[PDB]
Amino acid sequence: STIEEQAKTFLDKFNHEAEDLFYQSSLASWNYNTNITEENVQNMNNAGDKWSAFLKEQSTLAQMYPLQEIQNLTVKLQLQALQQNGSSVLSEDKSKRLNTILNTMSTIYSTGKVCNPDNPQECLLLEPGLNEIMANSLDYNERLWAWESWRSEVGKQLRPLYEEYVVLKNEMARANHYEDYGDYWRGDYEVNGVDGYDYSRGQLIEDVEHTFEEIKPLYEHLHAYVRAKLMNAYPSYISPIGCLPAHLLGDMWGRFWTNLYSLTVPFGQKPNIDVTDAMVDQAWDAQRIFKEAEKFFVSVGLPNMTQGFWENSMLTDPGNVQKAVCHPTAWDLGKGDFRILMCTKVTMDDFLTAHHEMGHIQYDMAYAAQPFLLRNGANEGFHEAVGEIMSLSAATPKHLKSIGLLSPDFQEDNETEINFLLKQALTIVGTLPFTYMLEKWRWMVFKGEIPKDQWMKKWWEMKREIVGVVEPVPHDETYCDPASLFHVSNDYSFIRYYTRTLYQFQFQEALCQAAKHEGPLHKCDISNSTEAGQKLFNMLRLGKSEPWTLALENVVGAKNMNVRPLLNYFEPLFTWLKDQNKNSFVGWSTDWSPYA
Amino acid sequence: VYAWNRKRISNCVADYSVLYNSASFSTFKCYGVSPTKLNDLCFTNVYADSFVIRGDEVRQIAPGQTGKIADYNYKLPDDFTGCVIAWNSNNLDSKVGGNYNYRYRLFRKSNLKPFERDISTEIYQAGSKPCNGVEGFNCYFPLQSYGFQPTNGVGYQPYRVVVLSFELLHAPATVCGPKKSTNLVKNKCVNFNFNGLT
Numbered sequence A: 001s002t003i004e005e006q007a008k009t010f011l012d013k014f015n016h017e018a019e020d021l022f023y024q025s026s027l028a029s030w031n032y033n034t035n036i037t038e039e040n041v042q043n044m045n046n047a048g049d050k051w052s053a054f055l056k057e058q059s060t061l062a063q064m065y066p067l068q069e070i071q072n073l074t075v076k077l078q079l080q081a082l083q084q085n086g087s088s089v090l091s092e093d094k095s096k097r098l099n100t101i102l103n104t105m106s107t108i109y110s111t112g113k114v115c116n117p118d119n120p121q122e123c124l125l126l127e128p129g130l131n132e133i134m135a136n137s138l139d140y141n142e143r144l145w146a147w148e149s150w151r152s153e154v155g156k157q158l159r160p161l162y163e164e165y166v167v168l169k170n171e172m173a174r175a176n177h178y179e180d181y182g183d184y185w186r187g188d189y190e191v192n193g194v195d196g197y198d199y200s201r202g203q204l205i206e207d208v209e210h211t212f213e214e215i216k217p218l219y220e221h222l223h224a225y226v227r228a229k230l231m232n233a234y235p236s237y238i239s240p241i242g243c244l245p246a247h248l249l250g251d252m253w254g255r256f257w258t259n260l261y262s263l264t265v266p267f268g269q270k271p272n273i274d275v276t277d278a279m280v281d282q283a284w285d286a287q288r289i290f291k292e293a294e295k296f297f298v299s300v301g302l303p304n305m306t307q308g309f310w311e312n313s314m315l316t317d318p319g320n321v322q323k324a325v326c327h328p329t330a331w332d333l334g335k336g337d338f339r340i341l342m343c344t345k346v347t348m349d350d351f352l353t354a355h356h357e358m359g360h361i362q363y364d365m366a367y368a369a370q371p372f373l374l375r376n377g378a379n380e381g382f383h384e385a386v387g388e389i390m391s392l393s394a395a396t397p398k399h400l401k402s403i404g405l406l407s408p409d410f411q412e413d414n415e416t417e418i419n420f421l422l423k424q425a426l427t428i429v430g431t432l433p434f435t436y437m438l439e440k441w442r443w444m445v446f447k448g449e450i451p452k453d454q455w456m457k458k459w460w461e462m463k464r465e466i467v468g469v470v471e472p473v474p475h476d477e478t479y480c481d482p483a484s485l486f487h488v489s490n491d492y493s494f495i496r497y498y499t500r501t502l503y504q505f506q507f508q509e510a511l512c513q514a515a516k517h518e519g520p521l522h523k524c525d526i527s528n529s530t531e532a533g534q535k536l537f538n539m540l541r542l543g544k545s546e547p548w549t550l551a552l553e554n555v556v557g558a559k560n561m562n563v564r565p566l567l568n569y570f571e572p573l574f575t576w577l578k579d580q581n582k583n584s585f586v587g588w589s590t591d592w593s594p595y596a
Numbered sequence B: 001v002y003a004w005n006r007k008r009i010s011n012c013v014a015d016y017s018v019l020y021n022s023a024s025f026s027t028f029k030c031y032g033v034s035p036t037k038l039n040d041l042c043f044t045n046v047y048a049d050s051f052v053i054r055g056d057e058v059r060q061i062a063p064g065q066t067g068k069i070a071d072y073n074y075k076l077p078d079d080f081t082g083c084v085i086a087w088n089s090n091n092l093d094s095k096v097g098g099n100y101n102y103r104y105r106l107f108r109k110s111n112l113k114p115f116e117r118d119i120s121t122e123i124y125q126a127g128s129k130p131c132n133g134v135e136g137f138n139c140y141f142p143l144q145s146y147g148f149q150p151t152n153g154v155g156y157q158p159y160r161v162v163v164l165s166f167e168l169l170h171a172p173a174t175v176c177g178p179k180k181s182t183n184l185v186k187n188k189c190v191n192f193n194f195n196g197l198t
């Protein structure tokens, strides 16, 4: 009869016939990941094509129901999600060209091999040939050669492709009632129709700038300290008044600063909190690691893992005969089937990764009650954030002492807290200016603020202004320096890390306040607190049914993203860095003072 | 579940203790009678309804419940006397390719009456528009297949449900429980109960 009942029956029909197809596609993807064979690749391709065709047909049927005659929030949200054209609105020739461009960029990035001229008999790929050199070398010219050669080859190949890509994506986005592709990406956080909890696409950029302005003093002090330490490591290259050289950040692109912990350690004499040896001595298997993680989740009050999880997951490397992807990934296959694919080793990093992926599994399990098309996070930030909070909680010394991995008589003095906080800042705080600068540059490129002939002149100017990183040598317009990163080349949003980082500490403050922790934020563990788990599970159960603003109100009590928990987390480190930067000069100059 | 089997059990002795003492059943919820006194009481007829549902849908097989199964597939009366027995059947009813032999009625204009079987295969009309016999837009086929895989979760795994319905009618009750004989003792003054004569 009415439009709302028709939409509800159609949505039921969609969820029922879409859950099984999604399960088949996900199972084919799992079979490919755990067993890399040509038939598995063919099965994955066939399942993906069937899934995409079914989604296209259901979207085509879905568009015939007008949005304005539906009052139920969940039904309206599912209809809005289904009725998106995506690439369908574009012409078949341009759609095929866009798909071909994306695939060829994927092949060029994945199979890109670059080596030194005059010695071409063998070459090194990016992983792990170039990663180890970027992360461990202390030689200026070798790192400079690797960075410049890889950007030269990849940028020169990808620059016309990127020029076509921006135009095609802008055409698709403007055809889809968006201002640009940046507006399309910013539409994920858009909330419409809820009184008081509405969020606009335009508000996201303003909020990011407002938070980053408060991020800037801490980043400036951290940059000054890292600059001083790198000056100690490399005597003549780094200038006291200028920016840091691009190839010296410890990674290929500057995404993380975690590879500079050895060079920039405050107290080298003091020991670390490494617990790898304790697990090796007591013969801790990967199964024990996952059982301890499960014990942590039942300690906080969340449901324990299913029998299917233990039976069907691959938590150890299979062997030489069977090939598998080594990247840790949590799979929500559908129909209550949750698995983790990780090549787990006896390391602290794998243990934290196991907690992070099991957090992903818990998040996936929580919204199983919801309809199929709403079985996701409220935004892209929350899904990563719920894993990151478990990663934060598991790494604390209190958690290690509780589970027996650390000695009960370990002395927790201020120096270990300072060096640990500095390492966490290098991993977490350091990615924020790079992420903000890259997303703002991409948004300006999509918007048309920056013409194609002026992409790099602005970009380096942005990098000096925001990231405090200077180019080693000037680059002309033949280079395509941003596209050397995995996320940008394969059509992925990059603001998820920034939102995840702010949400991570907001959630951490909320759970620690719930758990009645009375000390520093970084010394807080969320184990043994039922109320904290209940508060988290209230947001977790909703999934995508409710706006992200309402979920944030449910957890932290705020209607907007906030920057204060990050500053509160690193406040001892902030005071220590302010004390240590009395002699040095905080801030940088955008000029070519170190090298150009 | 749309075409649930009904078997009428009459003119025999029903031993309920074998079912009760089994550990193979996940749900043994009895409504209107208790399992302890089932082995003593006698009933006129026993209705055994058998079907397969999902793990999450076992709760809907009860009086007063609401759902797809209760409204459109199998409806139980409020004044129901009997037992609902359900057990996991992942071992037999799930195959690697997917077992799609089990179907459920997803849409019907009105709710089912208690103990009603609907085997109609007419296209459901969700809109004013005439369906015209073809399954197109706003017109859907009511019977939807089920997907059963051996790696599914416990809430999606197939569960076999047998519902026993006990009714007493004015006709003589013939489905009686197994009375247990004792050993015979002779030459002593004892209280004898022979075939109801005490």
Ligand SMILES: *[C@@H]1O[C@H](CO)[C@@H](O)[C@H](O)[C@H]1NC(C)=O
Residues within 6 Å of the ligand: A035, A037, A322
């Ligand atoms: C992986 O694929 C090979 C190829 O035939 C097959 O023999 C083997 O059983 C597979 N192993 C698993 C765990 O799927």
Ligand SMILES: *[C@@H]1O[C@H](CO)[C@@H](O)[C@H](O)[C@H]1NC(C)=O
Residues within 6 Å of the ligand: A008, A072, A073, A074, A075
């Ligand atoms: C919206 O629909 C869902 C399922 O279709 C239903 O459970 C919920 O009560 C509806 N909300 C309102 C306000 O009617």
Ligand SMILES: *[C@@H]1O[C@H](CO)[C@@H](O)[C@H](O)[C@H]1NC(C)=O
Residues within 6 Å of the ligand: A063, A083, A084, A085, A088, A089, A177
């Ligand atoms: C999708 O595209 C079609 C035509 O290309 C258009 O009629 C329809 O309005 C679009 N959907 C939305 C939600 O705008």
Ligand SMILES: *[C@@H]1O[C@H](CO)[C@@H](O)[C@H](O)[C@H]1NC(C)=O
Residues within 6 Å of the ligand: A304, A305
């Ligand atoms: C998970 O929790 C349930 C209920 O608390 C319990 O019965 C079950 O044994 C647990 N599973 C494992 C593997 O510990």
Ligand SMILES: *[C@@H]1O[C@H](CO)[C@@H](O)[C@H](O)[C@H]1NC(C)=O
Residues within 6 Å of the ligand: A414, A415, A418, A576
């Ligand atoms: C740690 O505490 C001791 C004792 O108060 C103090 O002397 C030392 O300067 C502190 N170190 C740092 C890095 O705060």
Ligand SMILES: *[C@@H]1O[C@H](CO)[C@@H](O)[C@H](O)[C@H]1NC(C)=O
Residues within 6 Å of the ligand: A299, A402, A527, A528
């Ligand atoms: C949390 O509970 C476990 C289980 O009893 C216990 O072993 C652990 O010590 C508790 N945590 C703390 C900090 O006491």
